[PDB]
Symmetry: D2
Subunit: 226 residues, 4 copies
């Protein structure tokens, strides 16, 4: 009965407080999602000045409730089943041969808006590595995100490896370990194993002078025909 909150266009609000190797920063984001098409549009502004890490590294952190679950897979959509109350999304993101991000987020409805409020901590980054050295290109690849139930936590476990292209033609992996648990006590759907196929386009606003990211995503669940 959470799926019905997502049949139309839903306003999104995103706020993040972060710290990577002692570099403090905040980001605010806003846009809208239309989960019927698995589509979302968001714009992010670093409100504390220059972002200390590359924008691409925060795409996964900045609302999987907006994925398109096709009609035959609707019994497997944990994300929307947890709403309006929401879910807590936690991750550890291991940058290959560099630091890690640990994030904790609350994804829930605040009135009619879907809010994603995040805290992020980055530790052990090389000062001249690809992340703090700003060596990633401003683009993004398409991935598969593997979901499985975690029946003991009443939530789900999620694993995927992001590929960030590097300015020299190599690739920086970011291994994502994730867990989602309901905030409410209402019943949730615990899905069968499946995956999400993702696509992301990064761009800029020609008239925006603050450091910023314009993001459009398409995400569609697949994997189950039983």
């Amino acid at each position: 009965k959470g799926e019905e909150l997502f049949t139309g266009v839903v306003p999104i609000l995103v706020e993040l407080d972060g710290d990577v190797n002692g570099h403090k920063f905040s980001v605010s984001g806003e846009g809208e999602g239309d989960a019927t098409y698995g589509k979302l549009t968001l714009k992010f502004i670093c409100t504390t000045g220059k972002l200390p890490v590359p924008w691409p590294t925060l795409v996964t952190t900045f609302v999987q409730c907006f994925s398109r679950y096709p009609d035959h897979m609707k019994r497997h959509d944990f994300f929307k089943s947890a709403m309006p109350e929401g879910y807590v999304q936690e991750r550890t993101i291991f940058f290959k041969d560099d630091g890690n991000y640990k994030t904790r987020a609350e994804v829930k409805f605040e009135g009619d808006t879907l809010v994603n409020r995040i805290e992020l901590k980055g530790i052990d980054f090389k000062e001249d590595g690809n992340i703090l050295g700003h060596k990633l290109e401003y683009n993004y690849n398409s991935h598969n995100v593997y979901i499985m139930a975690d029946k003991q936590k009443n939530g789900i476990k999620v694993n995927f490896k992001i590929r960030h292209n590097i300015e020299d033609g190599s690739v920086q992996l970011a291994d994502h370990y994730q867990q989602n648990t309901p905030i409410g006590d209402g019943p949730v759907l615990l899905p069968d194993n499946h995956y999400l196929s993702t696509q992301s386009a990064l761009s800029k606003d020609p008239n925006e002078k603050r450091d910023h990211m314009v993001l459009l995503a398409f995400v569609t669940a697949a994997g189950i025909t039983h």
Copy 2:
């Protein structure tokens, strides 16, 4: 050979001259595509006044060389192999229980830009139908586009059905019959049967008073692992 021209961001120009049931109209489009990511961005303006048909019905008419062909399918990308000389793309589009569009286009490079120049004729539309009655929603679904070689023409045949959501909650089908033939006479890649998986985002430029459409697309080839 031709695929070398698409390894970076390529400027695009679209030009269409149309006539639907005698209603004449012209649209110009511009933007860019990055085939490495199967992505493109374009803004279309109706330069003659209001569009007499819904914008969504012209998305497929308005550069399948911008699809992403994964490296294991590179031998199957007819579209870029015809470049720079280009190809002619012709369609009959049958709107179920209504009229049809017939289109002929030349897609080729003119300098450094990839231009799509089109002529379109629509006949037999119902004045009270979904098309001239403007009853299509401003949204777009994801499709599978089926491609097969047409050896005798040294080109390809392509077939697919677009699903246009109507404001009354029904879907209007648009059955596409398409053929592509190279403009040049040199060798082109003729593919084994496969498909392209498409996603399209339609939106509006908030600063624009003319009738127009902003489109972002993602398209990736699939269906071949040999």
Copy 3:
């Protein structure tokens, strides 16, 4: 309606009368299929002596109603909707750089059994080619079979290319052009574009002295999530 006849194990009979370059031959087959699992098992015997062509070249000729259509695609299964009256299945099979087979078959129920009765004519084969020179390996690859409705015939058009491994390490293509038309005149399901994914195991019955083939197949429809 027709799909009700395939919820359990259905006996199958196959009968083919062939003529390739004047070499006449007949084959009979029998076994069973379980469409719930998209599976079938058949044993074929050449009742006239040795087969004048390789067994693998006749696998596609020798009951696509035994495919598994997942429940979200049940509206798209033309094959079972034509049952019990059946359909006529016709092909032209073009062996690249060699001859062609033309086939006409009636697939329908005769009592409780689903029988596939075929006539095949092969012309223009090279005496030293891979087919009459028996140079095909006794193995079979997995394919994607593309299906589209052919509204005017109230049937379907199907296209695919089979890859036959040759003993010298090369692959021999067999381009299939196929059309299916219902034998009865009542309504049938006409599908949206989709495909079937096929797998075939060929083997020998260790106790059998006649020329023969044991075949097990798995086939499942895909490509539609709407």
Copy 4:
């Protein structure tokens, strides 16, 4: 350099010692695999008399080195990279609302034959549940098996949920937790996340009087196009 041991047909030997709730049993199996097609054929004999659990429940226990990894995914085939030395395959299989199986197997080459030597322990089964009550049907569904690297163990972690149809029309889940670790010290490929699509056909030998299972499987890896 382990992939080369699987280019042709490879003899398989399977031996299992088990005990489920104090019911001791042994099974021997033999056949052959052709990983180029992702294909295997095996026959099992309960050599201690009547099998105490349903044959379908042991299919997953009775050589993922026989999966077909298509050419573009060959850097992700952990199973063949570990050969000739092999890997240890461990699982816990939780039957929903019933007992669990814990298995440990050695999969390695013994001369030219690929051997799978297993020990299985079943605990906590209901004496009249679906397993010890012999309530499962003799058939099998197709599944996706999700693979991820376990870089700390130099092996892989595997999760999937088998669906066993029950004689009353319901389904018995069997949740599979699996881990594979190399037996040798040679280097192995640690794959990116991906999955295997499986298909299995169970049958009987008309002339065999011992309790037995005849099994044919097709398995193909998918999921990676980078």
